[PDB]
Structures are given as structure tokens and as C-alpha cells.
């Protein structure tokens, strides 16, 4: 079987994870499940970026040691992914020796090759802006930020520097060979002012001002700078430079690195250059989504302008939480959270459109045939040929949207099919057919189309929702695992033996 490897970013446990982090991890989970259903050998990784001054500060901020603070935070994150039913195959932590050893190895290798050299970084850090500046960029100079008005802090410390400019021609050559590397196309607007043409400055890849992180074996006063440390997670979790590299050679290069837009530059410039320096294959694709916003900007874990996903899961359930994120907030833009939109998505799309349809269909199969669904014969009603064609086009359109990670467009397309199946009841009028004994076949045909239409939706929603499709298969009494796969949607009319549906149809209530 063909392999597929997808990653989220390793999240910085500086606070509790909000719904933006949930979107990222659910989005990657949707693809993982989707790819497993297509017949790929999938590995899906997530994790925690546990080193840095920022973690060292947040442990200070919560008046506590480094490793005690983290253990408590990592427990909460694993509990969240458990509650979200994320099908991640592994959880990488940068504090683990399996990661650390590889970072140490990589860093000493770059040292041996001459790629890195000892020096001093001198610059101007704006405390509010969280961005470094040169002295010429300062306003009223020891000066003000050009972006804001806050005066800057002078930062001088020993640092290793990585000669990245020599990989410029190979990087530009890689972009030419892989013009669709960054998806969606709007996200390579993050590559504006990239400095590749005029010349990339040597990157400061270690700190001496703090001591929390991966220490450089040659010079332990230095700690490896957080971004090269963090990016190693994608290859270290597969056992790169360990005594078993079987996962690395099976899954690398990664098919998708998933993220939000603000780390496209890091994943598109620094990460391929690092891989080039190790003579490793480059990632296939970078998929970057937008931000969930509030009323004071992007949802931020250090700021606290957040919605806790535990609140949404506890109150409304898992399916409503997962559906809302994927449907309401498109991959290719930013989006505002509101409690209004959440209940509308929950009640109108899930409980009504899908939930009514299932209840209506089972109620009529119980009423007219005593639960005994007649087998699919063919498109016997005059509308069936178009509707069966629509079902096939729904799967094809769904596929196109899913391959480009347009999750809201895929779900929107699925919901047009669900709505049309509700309208199919209205315009066929089974209750009227049921009065005439001579129309029993047509009535059977109509019920058969309703059940098959529902099965199409349920299969397509398996990557998105973990409970409701399973609940739908149980009530309709589709036990065969074959009828739950994508391949069974390739031709309409799967159920050609009669089926007994449930006698006590409960609400699906997704
Ligand atoms: N508002 C958001 N919308 C979507 N994704 C988000 C959001 N915030 C964080 N993420 C996800 O987390 C990744 C960034 O992880 P990070 O660890 O920095 O959390 P943070 O909230 O961005 O940081 P900070 O702690 O500085 O606010 C993004 O690339 C994205 O995957």
C-alpha cells in the first residue's frame, strides 16, 4: 500500500490550547482518516514545542519549575485530543531523548560541515512587537519601533550562525520544480519580502542568555534555538539518525505539513534549507490555514482572548464541535467565532437536515414495510437517474475539495445532497404511493433511494464525525464494513438484498 504522512505544528504549551489549535489538529485528523479510507498507509503526528525562553517564562509566570509545569500542561493537551478522538499515531515531545539526541546530532553535523560558525548577534528587540530590528530601522534613536511606538531593548549575546544563502539556487530551483508547494495559493503571499534574491543573512540558530533547551554537545553554554529544535520533530519522531530508521524511510518525505499562515515562511525557507544541509528529501506540500479571530484580533494563548474547546465539547458534544470548526471556518481565510453561528450549525445542519432525514426515512420504512427495506432494483422513479448522477458528482466534487483541503466546501457540497434527499421525500410523496397497493414497488424503490442517499452522506462524513455516521449505520442496520468505505460509493445501488432497519429509532442528534 502507498504511504501518506501528515503533521500538525508542535504547539507551544505556554497556556491552554484554544479552538484555533483544535481546528489545526481536527483538520489534520480529517485528512488522516480520509486517507486511511482511500487505502493509504497513514502516519499522523502532533506534539509539543517544550523548549525556549518563552516556556521558561511561562513556567516562571505560573511560579513553577520547567518539567513540572510541562507535565501538567502536556496531560491536558493529550486529554483534549482524547476528547476530540484524534487518530494521531504518535505524540512527539521535544523534551524526549529520542528528539533531543537527533537535534544534538544534526547540530554537530552542521558544525562538522562548516555550515554553522560561532559569533555574536547584536540587535534591537521590541518587547511589545516581538520582532528584532537593526539600528537603521529604529525611529528617533536606544530608539523606537517602526511598527509600533514602544522603545526597544538592546540584545547582545553569543550565538551560532547558519550559512543559508549558499542553498539559494537549489531553493529557487525547488520552487520552479514544485510551483504548487505552498497551498492554498494565497499563502505564498507570506513569502513577500523573503530576502532570497537580495541575499539571505546568516540565521542565528543558538542562544546563550537562557539555558532551557537542547544543549550543544560541543559548547553546552549554547542552547539550540527554538525553531531548528522544533522543526526537527517531523523527522526525529520517525527515528532519523537512530538505530531503527524504518519509519523515516517508510514515511519521509511528508505529504503535508499542516499549519496556520504565520509559520509558512519558517516551513518554506528554513526547513527545506536545513533538509538540504542534511541531504534529505524535501516535503511534498505545505498546507496553511487562516486564523480564528475574536473581537480583538487573532485568538492567542498568551493573550487569553480565547474559546476553550472543552467548553464546546462538554456542552454540545464532539460532532457539533468538529463540524462547526470545519464547516464555519474555511481553510483559505480568517473567521470570527460567535456562539450564534455555533448553535445554528448544530441545530440546522446536523439536527434538522441530517437528523430529520434519518428519522423520516426509518419512520416510513417501519410504517409501510414493518421495518423490512425492499432491495435496490434500479432508478425506477423518473427523478432517480438525475439524483443518482448527483450522488456520483457529490463524491467527485467532495474529492476535489478534500485533495485541496477546502473542508467547508466539501461539507457544503455534502449538505446540498442531504437537502435534495429531504426534497426527494416531498416530491415523491411516499404516503400517497402507500395508499395504492399497485404502487408498492415504487414505494419500495423510493425508500431504497432514501437509505442509499443517507449511506452516501454517512460514508462521506466518517472523516469529519466519529459518532453520528456510526449511529446511522446501526439504525439502518448496515453491518458490512464494505458498505462503509469510499469504494462502495463508486456505483449507486449497494443494498440489493432486503434489510431490517431498527424498531426503536433514537435521535442521531449530532
Ligand atoms: N487563532 C488561531 N487560528 C488557527 N490556528 C491557530 C490559532 N492559534 C494557533 N493556531 C495553531 O497553532 C499554531 C501556532 O501554535 P502556537 O503554539 O504559537 O500558539 P499561539 O496561540 O499561536 O501562540 P501565542 O502563544 O503566542 O499566542 C498555528 O500555526 C496554528 O496551527
Question: Which residue's CA is minimally distant from atom 18 of ligand 1?
Answer: 12
DSSP string, 254-290: PSEEEEEGGGHHIIIIIHHHHHHHTT-PPPS-EEEE-
- Answer whether 247's CB lies under 8 Å from 66's CB: no
**Rounded CA gap, 222 and 161, in Å?**
12
Helices and strands, number each (H, E), in the chain: 19, 16
Task: Give strand pairing partners of 90.
Answer: 45
Alpha helices (H) along 39-113 = 53-61, 66-83, 97-113
| Ligand 1 atom closest to 12 (CA) | 17
The answer to whether residues 341 and 296 touch, using CB atoms and an 8 Å cutoff, is: no
Locate the domains of the chain by residue range: 1-114+227-337, 115-226, 338-510
Enclosing H/E stretch for 48: strand 41-48
3-state helix/strand/coil string of 176-204 = HHCCCCEECHHHHHCCCCCCCCCCCCCEE
As annotated, the binding site includes 301
How many CB atoms neighbour CB 504 within 10 A?
Answer: 7
CA-based Rg of the chain, rounded to a whole angstrom? Answer: 27
Backbone angles phi, psi at 181, to 5 degrees: -60, -45
Grid cell, residue 481, equals 464494513
Annotated binding residues for ATP: 301
- How many Å lie between the centroid of ligand 1 and the Cα of residue 9? 9
What nine digits make up the cell of 325?
A: 470548526
- Please tell me the number of Cα atoms within 13 Å of 202 on its side-chain side: 15
Other Cβ atoms closer than 10 A to 201: 11
CA distances from residue 28 to 73, 174, 395, 461, 464 in whole angstroms, order as listed: 22, 25, 20, 15, 11
How much distance in Å is there from the Cα of 467 to the middle of ligand 1? Answer: 28
Owner of C-alpha cell 499522523: 44
- Report the distance separating Cα 58 and Cα 302, nearest Å: 9
Compute the distance between CA of residue 123 and CA of residue 156 in angstroms, rounded to an integer.
Answer: 7
Burial of 109 (0-12, 13-18, 19+ CB in 10 A): middle
The values of phi and psi at residue 90, to 5°, are -160, 160
Looking from the CA of residue 263, the nearest atom of ligand 1 is 29
Q: Which atom of ligand 1 is nearest to 49's Cα?
A: 17
Q: CA-CA distance, 303 to 369, in Å (whole number)?
A: 59
Give the number of C-alpha atoms closer than 13 A to the C-alpha of residue 197, restricted to the C-beta side.
4
| Contact of 81 with 88, CB cutoff 8 Å | yes
User: Rounded to 5 degrees, what angle do the CA atoms 366, 368, 373 make?
Assistant: 65
Q: Which of 230, 224, 289 is nearest to 26 (CA)?
A: 289
Distance from C-alpha of 230 to C-alpha of 271, rounded to nearest angstrom: 10
Atom of ligand 1 nearest to the CA of 24: 31
Residues 282, 268 contacting (CB under 8 angstroms): no
Nearest to 155 by CA among 130, 122, 204, 133: 122
Residue 187 Cβ inside 6 Å of ligand 1? The answer reads no
Residue 47 in contact with ligand 1 by CB distance below 6 A: no
All three cell numbers of 149, joined, read 511606538
- Give the whole-angstrom CA distance, residue 273 versus residue 17: 30
Residue nearest ligand 1's atom 15 by CA? 11
Residues with Cβ within 8 Å of residue 339, at least 6 apart in sequence? none
Q: What are phi and psi of 482, to 5 degrees?
A: -60, -40
**Residues 6 or more apart whose Cβ sits within 8 Å of residue 451:** 361, 365, 373, 476, 495, 499, 501
CB of 256 within 6 A of ligand 1: the answer is: no
Counting from 1 in the atom list of ligand 1, the atom nearest the Cα of 303 is 27
d(CA 187, CA 405) in angstroms, rounded, equals 13
**CA of residue 167 to ligand 1 center, whole Å:** 29
Query: How many Å lie between the centroid of ligand 1 and the Cα of residue 292?
Result: 9
Q: Ligand 1 centroid to 377 CA: how many Å?
A: 52
Whether 337 lines ligand 1, by a CB cut-off of 6 Å, is no
Q: How far apart are CA 347 and CA 510, in angstroms?
A: 8
**Other CB atoms within 10 Å distance of the CB of residue 401:** 19
1-17 in b/e form (b: 16+ CB < 10 A) is eeebbbbbbbbbbbbbb
- Ligand 1 close to Cβ of residue 269 (< 6 A): no
Q: For ligand 1, what atom is nearest to the CA of residue 8? A: 31
Q: Look at ligand 1, atom 28, and give the residue with the nearest C-alpha.
A: 260
Q: Whose CA is nearest to atom 27 of ligand 1?
A: 300
Element housing 37 (H / E): helix 19-38
Q: Which residue has the cell 417501519?
A: 366
- 120 C-alpha to ligand 1 centroid (Å): 30
Question: Of the candidates 380, 402, 202, which has an alpha carbon nearest to the alpha carbon of residue 287?
Answer: 402
Cα maximum dimension of the chain: 93
Contact 415, 349 (CB under 8 A): yes
Please give the Cα distance from 234 to 236 (Å, whole number): 6
DSSP 450-484: HHHHHHHHHHHHTTT-SSHHHHHHHHHT---GGGG
β-pairing, 203-204 with 206-207? unpaired
Residue 260 CA: which ligand 1 atom is closest? 29
Residue 17 Cβ inside 6 Å of ligand 1? The answer reads no
Cα distance between residue 429 and residue 447, in whole Å: 11
The 8-class DSSP code of residue 347 comes to: I
Query: Would the CB of 299 count as within 6 Å of ligand 1?
Result: yes
Report residue 41 as a C-alpha cell.
Answer: 498507509
Q: Which three cell numbers stand for residue 422?
A: 429531504
In this structure, the number of other CB atoms found within 10 A of the CB of residue 497 comes to 7
Instruction: Tell which residue, 86, 113, 115, has the closest CA to residue 28.
Output: 86
Q: To test ligand 1's pocket by mutation, which of 10, 15, 20, 271 has the most ligand atoms within 8 angstroms of CB?
A: 20
Q: Does the beta carbon of 272 lie inside 6 Å of ligand 1?
A: no
Cβ 22 under 6 angstroms from ligand 1:
no
- Other CB atoms within 10 A of residue 496 CB: 9
Question: How many A from CA of 375 to the centre of ligand 1?
Answer: 50
For cell 543559508, the residue is 164
Helices (H), 370-439: 384-403, 407-428, 430-435
Burial class (CB in 10 A: 0-12, 13-18, 19+), 40: middle
Structure's resolution in angstroms: 2.5
Question: CA 280 to CA 392: how far, in whole Å?
Answer: 41
Please tell me if the CB atom of residue 257 comes closer than 6 angstroms to any atom of ligand 1: no
- Whether the CB-CB separation of 468 and 506 falls below 8 Å is answered with no
Amino acid at each position: 500500500k502507498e504511504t501518506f504522512y501528515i503533521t500538525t505544528p508542535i504547539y507551544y504549551p505556554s497556556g491552554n490550547l484554544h479552538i484555533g489549535h483544535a481546528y489545526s489538529t481536527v483538520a489534520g485528523d480529517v485528512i488522516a482518516r480520509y486517507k486511511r479510507m482511500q487505502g493509504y498507509d497513514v502516519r499522523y503526528l502532533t506534539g509539543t514545542d517544550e523548549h525556549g525562553q518563552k516556556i521558561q517564562e511561562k513556567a516562571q509566570k505560573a511560579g513553577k519549575t520547567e518539567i513540572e509545569y510541562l507535565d501538567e500542561m502536556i496531560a491536558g493537551i493529550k486529554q483534549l485530543w482524547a476528547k476530540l478522538e484524534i487518530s494521531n499515531d504518535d505524540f512527539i515531545r521535544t523534551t524526549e531523548e529520542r528528539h533531543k539526541h537527533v537535534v544534538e546530532q544534526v547540530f554537530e553535523r552542521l558544525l562538522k560541515q562548516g555550515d554553522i560558525y560561532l559569533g555574536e548577534y547584536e540587535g534591537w528587540y521590541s518587547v511589545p512587537d516581538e520582532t528584532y530590528y537593526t539600528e537603521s530601522q529604529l525611529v528617533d534613536p536606544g530608539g523606537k519601533s517602526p511598527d509600533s511606538g514602544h522603545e526597544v531593548e538592546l540584545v547582545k549575546e553569543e550565538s551560532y550562525f547558519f550559512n543559508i544563502s549558499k542553498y539559494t539556487d537549489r531553493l529557487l530551483e525547488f520552487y520552479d520544480q514544485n510551483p504548487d508547494f505552498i497551498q492554498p495559493p494565497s499563502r505564498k503571499n507570506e513569502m513577500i519580502n523573503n530576502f532570497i534574491k537580495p541575499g539571505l543573512a546568516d540565521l542565528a540558530v543558538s542562544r546563550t542568555s537562557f539555558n532551557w533547551g537542547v544543549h550543544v554537545p560541543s559548547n553546552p553554554k549554547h542552547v539550540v534555538y527554538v525553531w531548528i529544535d522544533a522543526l526537527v520533530n517531523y523527522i526525529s519522531a520517525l527515528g532519523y539518525l537512530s538505530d531503527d530508521e524504518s519509519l523515516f524511510n517508510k514515511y519521509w518525505p511528508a505529504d503535508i505539513h499542516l499549519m496556520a499562515k504565520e509559520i509558512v515562511r519558517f516551513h518554506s525557507i528554513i526547513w527545506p534549507i536545513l533538509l538540504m544541509a542534511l541531504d534529505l528529501p524535501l516535503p511534498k506540500k505545505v498546507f496553511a490555514h487562516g486564523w480564528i479571530l475574536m473581537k480583538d484580533g487573532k485568538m492567542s494563548k498568551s493573550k487569553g482572548n480565547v474559546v476553550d474547546p472543552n467548553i464546546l465539547i462538554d456542552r454540545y458534544g464532539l460532532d457539533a464541535t468538529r463540524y462547526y470548526l470545519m464547516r464555519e471556518l474555511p481553510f483559505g481565510s480568517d473567521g470570527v467565532f460567535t456562539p450564534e453561528a455555533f448553535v445554528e450549525r448544530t441545530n440546522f445542519d446536523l439536527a434538522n437536515d441530517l437528523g430529520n432525514l434519518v428519522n423520516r426515512t426509518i419512520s416510513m420504512v417501519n410504517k409501510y414495510f414493518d421495518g423490512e427495506l425492499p432491495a435496490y432494483q434500479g432508478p425506477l422513479h423518473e427523478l432517480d437517474e438525475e439524483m443518482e448522477a448527483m450522488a456520483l458528482e457529490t463524491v467527485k466534487s467532495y474529492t476535489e475539495s478534500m485533495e485541496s483541503l477546502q473542508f467547508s466546501v466539501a461539507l457544503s457540497t455534502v449538505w446540498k445532497f442531504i437537502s435534495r434527499t429531504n426534497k426527494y421525500i416531498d416530491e415523491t410523496t411516499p404516503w400517497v404511493l402507500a395508499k395504492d397497493d399497485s404502487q408498492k414497488d415504487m414505494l419500495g424503490n423510493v425508500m431504497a433511494h432514501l437509505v442509499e442517499n443517507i449511506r452516501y452522506a454517512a460514508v462521506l462524513l466518517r472523516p469529519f464525525l466519529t459518532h453520528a455516521p456510526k449511529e446511522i449505520f446501526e439504525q439502518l442496520n448496515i453491518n458490512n464494513p464494505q458498505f462503509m468505505e469510499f469504494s462502495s460509493l463508486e456505483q449507486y445501488g449497494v443494498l440489493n438484498e432486503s434489510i431490517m432497519v431498527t424498531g426503536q429509532p433514537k435521535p442521531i442528534f449530532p
